[PDB]
Symmetry: none
Subunit: 74 residues, 10 copies
């Protein structure tokens, strides 16, 4: 009854809607309702995962992130 | 009754809609309702996973991310 | 009753619609409803997975990502 | 009662529609409803998977991704 | 009661429509409803899978992806 | 009045005996004289030479050298 | 009046004997004279030479050297 | 009147014997004379040479040297 | 009247014997004379040479040297 | 009238014998004379040389040296 993780890199999100506008819900009229319920949003993220190494060992890594989305004249 | 992970790299998301506008739900009228329920959204993400190595070992990696989506005049 | 993963790289998402506008749901009228329910969306993502290696070992990798989608004058 | 994966690289998504506009659902009238339910969408993604190697070993890989979809004047 | 994979590379998606506009569903009138239910969409994705190798071993690979779909004046 | 080399791999040796036991040399008597004068002796040597390459490019090579000459009981 | 080298890998040695036991040399008697005059002796040596490369590029190489000459009972 | 080298890897030695037991040299009698005059002796030496590279680039190399010459019972 | 070197790796030695037991040299009798005059002796030496690189770049290398010559019972 | 070096790694030694037991040298009798005159002797030496790099850059290297020559019972 347990979990073991080593050098594991993962991204995610757990969420349960359950009822949500249910179970004896008249509702009738609803306007533009925008809610953020769970979800995994990651951008420009770097990570490094390594196991066990014996003897001489060296790790080298380089990353770069400049700008992403650009909106023109509207 | 457990899970073991080593040098594993994965991206995902778990979500349950369940009822959602159900179970005795009249609804009647609903406007543009936009909600984010679960989902995996990753962009410009780098990662490194390695196992066990014996003796001399070296790791080298390089990544670059500049701009992505561009919107013209609307 | 368990799972074992080593140097595994996968991307996905688990989601259950369940009822969703069901189970005693009149509905009647519904406007443009856009909701994000589960899904795997990954762009510009790099990863490296290796097993166990004995003796001298070296890993080299390079990736580049510049721009992607471009929208012209509308 | 378990699963074992080593150096496995796969992309996918699991989703269940279930009822969805069913089970005592009048519906009547429905507008342009667009929802994202499960699905695997990956673009510009690179990955490397290797097994166990004995003795001297070297891995070299290079990938490049510039632009993709372009929209002209509308 | 388990599955074993080694150096396996596959892309796919599992989804169940189930009822979907069924099971006591009047429907009556439905507008242009576009929903993404399951599916495998991968473009510009590269991967490498190798088994176990004894003695000296080297792996070299190179891929390139520039532009894809282009829309002219409409 | 010059030389140009690019990605050239060669092994050799330049030596001039000139006089050597000459030019007014009585000599008379000479014992087992063993001298090493110039010569190219290379064993277990590896090298890689490449020219100019445009676009994505990858190089992979592996060599091994274990034992060579063995002398039995004398 | 010059030399240009790029990514060139060569092994050699320059030596001039000139006179050596010459030019008014009686000598008379000479015992086992062993002298090392110039010469190229390289064993278990590895090297890598590459030119100019444009765009993504990766280099991978692996070499091993264990034992060489073995003398038995004399 | 000059020399230019770039990413060049070479091993050698320059030596001039000149007279050496010459030019009015009686000598008469000479015992086992052993002298080391110039020469290139390199064993278990590794080196890496690369030119100019544009864009993402990665270099990976691994070498090993254990034992070489072995003398048995004499 | 000059020399230019960039990322150049070489091993050697310059020596001039000149006269050496010459030029009005009776000598008469000489015992086992052993002198070290110039010469290049390098063992278990590693080096790395790289040129100019633009953009992301990574270098990885690993070397090992254990024991070499072994003398048995004499 | 000058020399320019950048990221250059070399090992050597300059020595001139000149006269040495010459120029009006009777000598007559000489015992086992052992003198060290110039020469390059390097063992277990590592070095790293790199040029100019623009943007993100990482360098990783690892070396090991244990024991070398072993003398048995004499």
């Amino acid at each position: 009854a347990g979990k073991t993780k080593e050098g594991v890199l993962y991204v995610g999100s757990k969420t349960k809607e359950g009822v949500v506008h249910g179970v004896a819900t008249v509702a009738e009229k609803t306007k533009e309702q925008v809610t953020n319920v769970g979800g995994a949003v990651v951008t420009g993220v770097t990570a490094v995962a390594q196991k066990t190494v014996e003897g001489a060992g060296s790790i080298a890594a380089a990353t770069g992130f400049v700008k992403k989305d650009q909106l023109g004249k509207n």
